[PDB]
Structures are given as structure tokens and as C-alpha cells.
Design a protein around this nucleic acid. Structure first.
Ligand SMILES: [Zn+2]
Ligand SMILES: [Zn+2]
Ligand SMILES: [Zn+2]
Length: 85
DNA sequence: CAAACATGAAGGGTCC
DNA sequence: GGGACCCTTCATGTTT
């Protein structure tokens, strides 16, 4: 009822955080909308994709600031950036 | 064959 | 709303 909490429409559990209901709903539906650009593994949250990318940034340190895609060469990252703008 | 242990994935808290 | 990191539980694998 408070602005800090939401009720899940599927399971009626209370969830904390104004924007944090969608990440809970995806745990029901299985939606994994974040994909590692290197190994294509998918994740339910940007949260855990960012941590997963640590596996790759040792060899691919050039990171997109919009989506976190990792690249071995800066000219690869620059070509990626065309996709955003 | 079970119990302990390591590791990490999953999910929800919590604070900018 | 988003990013970021924390905290706890639990699943899986490995060691003892
Ligand atoms: Zn729910
Ligand atoms: Zn990956
Ligand atoms: Zn990008």
C-alpha cells in the first residue's frame, strides 16, 4: 500500500522498491531479456548480466556504456555504437 | 553411500 | 524508473 512496496499480481507477494516489480514478474514468466553479446547466455536482470560480463572483460575490456557489450578492440566497440544512435 | 564443504545461481532487500 | 551491490537461501558439484 505504501509507495515503497508493490503487490505481485500473480502471487500476491509484497515486493520492495518502486521500480522492482518487473524483475519479480520475470521470475514467474521466465523472461530473460538481457543477453551476453559474447556467449549469448540470457539473464532475467541487468544486475546479473553485469556480473557475468566480468568473465569476459579480461580479454574484452572495451565496454559499451549503453548496454554493456564487451569487445576486444576499440574499433569493434565503435562499430557497435552505431547500433545505438 | 552420506555428510561437509565450495561455488555460484536465484531472488528479494536496500541505497543512491 | 534505473544502476549497483548486499544478504540469504538453495541447487549443484566436489571433497572427505
Ligand atoms: Zn509473484
Ligand atoms: Zn557471456
Ligand atoms: Zn551497446
Amino acid at each position: 500500500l505504501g509507495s515503497a512496496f508493490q503487490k505481485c499480481p500473480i502471487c500476491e507477494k509484497v515486493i520492495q522498491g518502486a521500480g522492482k516489480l518487473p524483475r519479480h514478474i520475470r521470475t514467474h514468466t521466465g523472461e530473460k531479456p538481457y543477453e551476453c553479446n559474447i556467449c549469448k547466455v540470457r539473464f532475467t536482470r541487468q544486475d546479473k548480466l553485469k556480473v557475468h560480463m566480468r568473465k569476459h572483460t579480461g580479454e574484452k575490456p572495451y565496454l559499451c556504456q549503453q548496454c554493456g557489450a564487451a569487445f576486444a578492440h576499440n574499433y569493434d566497440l565503435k562499430n557497435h555504437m552505431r547500433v545505438h544512435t
